[PDB]
């Protein structure tokens, strides 16, 4: 029964059997109770602060060919861009002037910057007294070491799917084994490390989602980024179905329940598939948001998926907008860098 599954989640009996049933039950009452549980666990462990991570998507050049992604190298219907290191540093400075306590640098897997230009950029931003999070994909250990020495604090590297067969199909340049080895190296080097997956990929099952949750629990990641798959018209997956918002929201809720002290963003993909999706997600376990800080005229060219919200807004709009969002949600802005605050338990 739904009531029995909630009782087991409340007692932290996180068996495969319990997680599968939670994801399989579609009862509105059960779902609402699950979201309430996750919301309460979030409030108890990580409080009411919503941590703002200002994201600068500094290049849409990519060497990889992921089947879901609009930046895949085979996509010729996309104007490619690269911000200069001076542009990136000064754009980061502007975010810090607007109150950002974490700068996130994200790109396609663009060889041009790697590793030294990134190191130089990271060193300049670290002078501003903020946390730096990188999201640059898969690189050699030596690059990750150099970036950590340069001052990088965190690394976001979504594991995408924990099914190694699906992973290899969707990401033909690499493997789940590679992705996991990247994540383990990041952890070893002392990064606060973020993983997470997409929900509703072509061929992905409920059992795969259960494996995603068990994988996250196993490795105790500091951050978990979860969003729905959104098909992009300039990719091989163009005609496939979008991920379901409510199922994806259940994955966020379960992630909070399993990893109560983790940092969990309300992802832009959630706000893209449903108007107000990020706000809902912030009320179902999430405690982080990433306002878009990519400048014009490049913001519109960073199209991992279509319809992406905030593309049409003035450059500087998203930090003020999320501060208003945080207030109308009855939440507080983060006071410090919002690093993980571990609660050791049993
Ligand atoms: C309580 C009021 C007034 C009902 C009335 O007219 N009396 C009604 C009017 C519109 C209703 C919402 C929408 O339907 C969208 C959504 C559907 C979900 O399924 C349940 C949640 C949600 C948010 C609904 C909640 C509630 O039910 C609302 C606020
Ligand atoms: C505002 C509306 C309508 C209330 C009304 O008009 N009557 C009520 C009806 C059902 C409520 C949601 C559910 O509880 C699940 C979940 C619990 C979390 O804790 C907080 C988030 C969330 C999404 C709730 C938000 C909000 O509270 C809802 C939409
Ligand atoms: C950047 C410019 C010029 C002055 C400047 O360079 N200020 C550096 C401040 C550095 N921090 C204190 C944030 C660290 C200053 C002048 C007025 C400032 C806004 C208002 O106050 C309202 C609001 C308060 C929030 O709280 C943060 C967001 C927001 C929109 C502010 C952003 C920014 O800060 C503004 C634009
Ligand atoms: C109103 C929109 C649908 C808009 C629409 O239908 N656009 C055309 C297609 C739908 C899409 C997803 C729905 C929410 C999720 O289910 C999660 C959650 C379940 C709770 O039970 C009730 C509250 C909540 C937040 C739901 C409210 C509402 O129902 C949403 C926003
Ligand atoms: C400048 C724009 C308009 C308004 C909209 C919401 C306002 C924030 C919230 O009111 C909460 C809090 C008070 C301080 C802080 C973060 C405010 C700063 C500023 O006043 C904001 C950004
Ligand atoms: N079509 C799509 N729908 C939803 N999310 C997508 C998507 N395409 C890509 N993403 C998500 O966007 C994230 C950032 S991709 C940018 C960073 C780096 N190149 C990397 O691959 O890690 C990915 O991890 C993926 O989960
Ligand atoms: S998901 Fe990352 S690595 Fe894959 S094509 Fe997109 S930008 Fe490149
Ligand atoms: S956060 Fe982009 S304008 Fe609302
Ligand atoms: Cl994320
Ligand atoms: Cl996103």
Swiss-Prot record:
Outcome, altering residue 69 to A: Eliminates binding of one iron-sulfur cluster
Residues holding [4Fe-4S] cluster: 62, 66, 69
Highest taxon in the source lineage: Bacteria
GO molecular function, one term: 2 iron, 2 sulfur cluster binding
EC number of this enzyme: 1.8.-.-
SMART domains reported in the protein's UniProt record: BATS, Elp3
Transport found in the keyword field: no
Complexes and interactors: Monomer.
Protein name: [FeFe] hydrogenase maturase subunit HydE
Organism: Thermotoga maritima (strain ATCC 43589 / DSM 3109 / JCM 10099 / NBRC 100826 / MSB8)
């Amino acid at each position: 029964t739904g009531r029995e599954i909630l009782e087991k989640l409340e007692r932290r009996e996180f068996t495969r059997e319990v997680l599968k049933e939670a994801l399989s039950i579609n009862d509105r009452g059960f779902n609402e109770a699950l979201f309430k549980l996750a919301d309460e666990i979030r409030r108890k462990y990580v409080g009411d602060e919503v941590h703002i991570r200002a994201i600068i998507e500094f290049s849409n050049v990519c060497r990889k060919n992921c089947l879901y992604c609009g930046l895949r190298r085979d996509n010729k219907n996309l104007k490619r861009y690269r911000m200069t290191p001076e542009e990136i540093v000064e754009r980061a400075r502007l975010a810090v002037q607007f109150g950002a306590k974490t700068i996130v640098l994200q790109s396609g897997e663009d060889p041009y910057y790697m590793p030294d230009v990134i190191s130089d950029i990271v060193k300049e931003i670290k002078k501003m007294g903020v946390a730096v999070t990188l999201s640059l994909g898969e690189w050699p250990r030596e690059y990750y070491e150099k970036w950590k020495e340069a001052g990088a604090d965190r690394y976001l590297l979504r594991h995408e799917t924990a099914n190694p067969v699906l992973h290899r199909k969707l990401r033909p340049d690499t493997s789940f084994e590679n992705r996991l080895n990247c994540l383990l190296t990041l952890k070893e080097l002392g990064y606060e490390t973020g993983a997470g997956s997409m929900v509703g990929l072509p061929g992905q099952t409920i059992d795969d989602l259960v494996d995603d949750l068990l994988f996250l629990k196993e490795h105790d990641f500091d951050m978990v980024g979860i969003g729905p798959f959104i098909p992009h018209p300039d990719t091989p997956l163009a005609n496939e179905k979008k991920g379901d918002f409510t199922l994806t929201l259940k994955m966020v809720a379960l992630t909070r329940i399993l990893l109560p002290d983790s940092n969990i963003p309300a992802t832009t993909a959630m706000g893209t598939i449903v108007p107000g999706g990020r706000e809902i997600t912030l009320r179902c376990g999430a405690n982080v948001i990433m306002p878009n800080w990519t400048p014009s005229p490049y913001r519109q060219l960073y199209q991992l998926y279509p319809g992406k919200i905030c593309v049409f807004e003035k450059d500087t709009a998203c930090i003020p907008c999320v501060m208003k969002m945080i207030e109308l949600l009855g939440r507080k802005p983060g006071r410090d860098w919002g690093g993980r605050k571990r609660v050791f338990e049993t």
